[PDB]
Amino acid sequence: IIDGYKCKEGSHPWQVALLKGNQLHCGGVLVDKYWVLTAAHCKMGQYQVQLGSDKIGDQSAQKIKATKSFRHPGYSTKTHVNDIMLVRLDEPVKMSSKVEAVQLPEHCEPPGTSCTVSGWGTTTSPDVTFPSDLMCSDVKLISSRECKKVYKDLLGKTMLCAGIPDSKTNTCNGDSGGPLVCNDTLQGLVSWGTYPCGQPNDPGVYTQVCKYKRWVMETMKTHR
């Protein structure tokens, strides 16, 4: 997160870190005791999922291993359309004041809605610095029609854009898969941006979670 702020202790109990062993690979968001939602480009054969702390590599926070990933079958390694993936934990996580599933959206929030995205991505670019504490950035949903003025054909129908005009406040490397929450629901997953990060008027780009409600439900289901 570029030009962000330290998220407030325990206001983000749905935040998880996907680690490659010890080391930050991606963000993620808890959606149930057994399931984590993240970007498809974050996929690995296994993860260690850190839950329940704002501090990355917190020795007190529980890590749960996960080996099974369910990428949206439409994911494109070329365009990054459908950049969403569910991950099944090896064991369920106990809920508490530091660990809580996020609210999945019932509707799509419109342009202009105020949001916050969080992660442990670098706070500088291109020269990288990785933080201990979870960082937050307040952004606003930008309409497809505006965002297209910048990104043109790069933008698919289920990519959502967010940012602040004339401001560097944005996502960056390591923030991938993390939550964009607007109005107490998850509206986005961090997908991509321009590089270097934090360029004014270059929106951050997100998988628009309201468009995948059937798929998430179908994939998570536990009964029928």
PDB file of C-alpha atoms in Angstrom, residues 110-183:
ATOM      1  CA  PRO A 110     -21.862   2.270  -7.284  1.00  0.00           C
ATOM      2  CA  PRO A 111     -19.158   4.700  -8.464  1.00  0.00           C
ATOM      3  CA  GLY A 112     -18.207   7.224  -5.862  1.00  0.00           C
ATOM      4  CA  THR A 113     -18.683   4.818  -2.955  1.00  0.00           C
ATOM      5  CA  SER A 114     -16.013   5.179  -0.291  1.00  0.00           C
ATOM      6  CA  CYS A 115     -13.866   2.142   0.304  1.00  0.00           C
ATOM      7  CA  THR A 116     -10.686   0.881   2.067  1.00  0.00           C
ATOM      8  CA  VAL A 117      -8.205  -1.621   0.821  1.00  0.00           C
ATOM      9  CA  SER A 118      -5.618  -3.216   3.127  1.00  0.00           C
ATOM     10  CA  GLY A 119      -2.366  -5.169   2.784  1.00  0.00           C
ATOM     11  CA  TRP A 120       1.297  -5.793   3.628  1.00  0.00           C
ATOM     12  CA  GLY A 121       2.528  -4.895   0.210  1.00  0.00           C
ATOM     13  CA  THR A 122       5.384  -2.568  -0.341  1.00  0.00           C
ATOM     14  CA  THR A 123       4.853   1.044   0.686  1.00  0.00           C
ATOM     15  CA  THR A 124       7.226   2.352  -1.961  1.00  0.00           C
ATOM     16  CA  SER A 125       7.791   1.709  -5.723  1.00  0.00           C
ATOM     17  CA  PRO A 126       9.788   0.781  -7.641  1.00  0.00           C
ATOM     18  CA  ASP A 127      12.284   0.554  -4.772  1.00  0.00           C
ATOM     19  CA  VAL A 128      10.491  -1.742  -2.322  1.00  0.00           C
ATOM     20  CA  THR A 129       9.878  -1.556   1.427  1.00  0.00           C
ATOM     21  CA  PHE A 130       7.794  -4.129   3.148  1.00  0.00           C
ATOM     22  CA  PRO A 131       5.998  -3.148   6.375  1.00  0.00           C
ATOM     23  CA  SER A 132       5.391  -5.050   9.571  1.00  0.00           C
ATOM     24  CA  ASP A 133       1.881  -3.590  10.225  1.00  0.00           C
ATOM     25  CA  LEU A 134      -1.126  -3.975   7.904  1.00  0.00           C
ATOM     26  CA  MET A 135      -1.605  -0.784   5.824  1.00  0.00           C
ATOM     27  CA  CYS A 136      -4.809   0.724   4.628  1.00  0.00           C
ATOM     28  CA  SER A 137      -5.789   3.092   1.796  1.00  0.00           C
ATOM     29  CA  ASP A 138      -9.046   4.955   1.448  1.00  0.00           C
ATOM     30  CA  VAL A 139     -10.264   4.948  -2.150  1.00  0.00           C
ATOM     31  CA  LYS A 140     -13.417   5.529  -4.113  1.00  0.00           C
ATOM     32  CA  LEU A 141     -15.047   3.349  -6.745  1.00  0.00           C
ATOM     33  CA  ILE A 142     -14.532   4.704 -10.270  1.00  0.00           C
ATOM     34  CA  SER A 143     -17.101   3.904 -13.047  1.00  0.00           C
ATOM     35  CA  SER A 144     -16.066   1.543 -15.899  1.00  0.00           C
ATOM     36  CA  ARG A 145     -16.646   4.383 -18.294  1.00  0.00           C
ATOM     37  CA  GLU A 146     -14.085   6.671 -16.516  1.00  0.00           C
ATOM     38  CA  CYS A 147     -11.596   3.936 -15.823  1.00  0.00           C
ATOM     39  CA  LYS A 148     -11.675   2.935 -19.507  1.00  0.00           C
ATOM     40  CA  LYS A 149     -10.342   6.395 -20.396  1.00  0.00           C
ATOM     41  CA  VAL A 150      -7.128   5.256 -18.732  1.00  0.00           C
ATOM     42  CA  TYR A 151      -6.976   1.543 -19.366  1.00  0.00           C
ATOM     43  CA  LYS A 152      -8.982   1.067 -22.544  1.00  0.00           C
ATOM     44  CA  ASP A 153      -9.225  -2.589 -23.637  1.00  0.00           C
ATOM     45  CA  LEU A 154      -7.256  -3.834 -20.635  1.00  0.00           C
ATOM     46  CA  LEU A 155     -10.494  -3.485 -18.643  1.00  0.00           C
ATOM     47  CA  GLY A 156     -12.943  -6.343 -18.668  1.00  0.00           C
ATOM     48  CA  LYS A 157     -16.633  -6.219 -17.551  1.00  0.00           C
ATOM     49  CA  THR A 158     -15.914  -7.597 -14.112  1.00  0.00           C
ATOM     50  CA  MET A 159     -12.926  -5.563 -13.207  1.00  0.00           C
ATOM     51  CA  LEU A 160     -13.666  -2.794 -10.761  1.00  0.00           C
ATOM     52  CA  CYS A 161     -11.587   0.343 -10.461  1.00  0.00           C
ATOM     53  CA  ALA A 162     -10.812   2.480  -7.315  1.00  0.00           C
ATOM     54  CA  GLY A 163      -8.670   5.428  -6.480  1.00  0.00           C
ATOM     55  CA  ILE A 164      -8.543   9.115  -5.556  1.00  0.00           C
ATOM     56  CA  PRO A 165      -7.954  11.825  -8.115  1.00  0.00           C
ATOM     57  CA  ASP A 166      -4.408  13.319  -7.994  1.00  0.00           C
ATOM     58  CA  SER A 167      -3.309  10.953  -5.347  1.00  0.00           C
ATOM     59  CA  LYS A 168      -0.738   8.230  -5.032  1.00  0.00           C
ATOM     60  CA  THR A 169      -2.779   6.290  -2.472  1.00  0.00           C
ATOM     61  CA  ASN A 170      -2.995   2.778  -4.018  1.00  0.00           C
ATOM     62  CA  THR A 171      -2.156  -0.921  -3.977  1.00  0.00           C
ATOM     63  CA  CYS A 172       1.224  -2.416  -4.780  1.00  0.00           C
ATOM     64  CA  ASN A 173       3.297  -5.614  -4.946  1.00  0.00           C
ATOM     65  CA  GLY A 174       2.306  -7.955  -2.113  1.00  0.00           C
ATOM     66  CA  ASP A 175      -1.222  -6.475  -1.721  1.00  0.00           C
ATOM     67  CA  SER A 176      -2.649  -8.891  -4.396  1.00  0.00           C
ATOM     68  CA  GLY A 177      -5.738 -10.884  -3.273  1.00  0.00           C
ATOM     69  CA  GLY A 178      -6.533  -8.557  -0.465  1.00  0.00           C
ATOM     70  CA  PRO A 179      -9.922  -7.026   0.390  1.00  0.00           C
ATOM     71  CA  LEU A 180     -11.518  -3.820  -0.922  1.00  0.00           C
ATOM     72  CA  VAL A 181     -14.407  -3.238   1.488  1.00  0.00           C
ATOM     73  CA  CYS A 182     -17.094  -0.566   0.851  1.00  0.00           C
ATOM     74  CA  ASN A 183     -20.125  -0.175   3.116  1.00  0.00           C
TER      75      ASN A 183
END
